Design the sequence.
């Protein structure tokens, strides 16, 4: 509260580390469904069903332009990519399984990087 400061983790490397994690995502074999926005003009239902589209290129642009205030908001957008994928694609379709694979890949990099 006012004048009662809680010790806070050092956040000075967060931008560089989130960029490194995002680069590992972008170069993963199964990143191809997520590198670019889903084409809202070619995919029936997507714009209507998926209220907040998100993809790696948009995350990369936002990271490169100061649009993430903290690392938690970055992880929210990454997770949004895979939540969208799981809403729209069957679990064992190629895109659907890619999404499950990429979520697991991400969460392990996240804990390995930022949990101690
Ligand atoms: C995440 N998500 N969820 C759904 C879809 C997708 N991703 C796509 O659409 C991506 C986005 C841009 C193009 N493509 S692509 O067609 O898949 C593609 C990508 C690389 C490549 F070399 C060949 C084809 C579509 C149906 C629902």
Sequence:
């Amino acid at each position: 509260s006012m004048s009662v400061k809680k010790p806070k983790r050092d956040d000075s490397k967060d931008l560089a580390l989130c960029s490194m994690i995002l680069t590992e995502m972008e170069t993963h074999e199964d990143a191809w469904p997520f590198l670019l926005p889903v084409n809202l003009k070619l995919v029936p239902g997507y714009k209507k069903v998926i209220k907040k589209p998100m993809d790696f290129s948009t995350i990369r642009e936002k990271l490169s332009s100061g649009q993430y205030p903290n690392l938690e908001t970055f992880a929210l957008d990454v997770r949004l990519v895979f939540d969208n994928c799981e809403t729209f694609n069957e679990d064992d379709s190629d895109i659907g399984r890619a999404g499950h694979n990429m979520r697991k890949y991400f969460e392990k990099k996240w804990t390995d990087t930022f949990k101690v």
The longest helix spans residues 94-114. The CA atoms of residues 70 and 114 lie 13 Å apart.
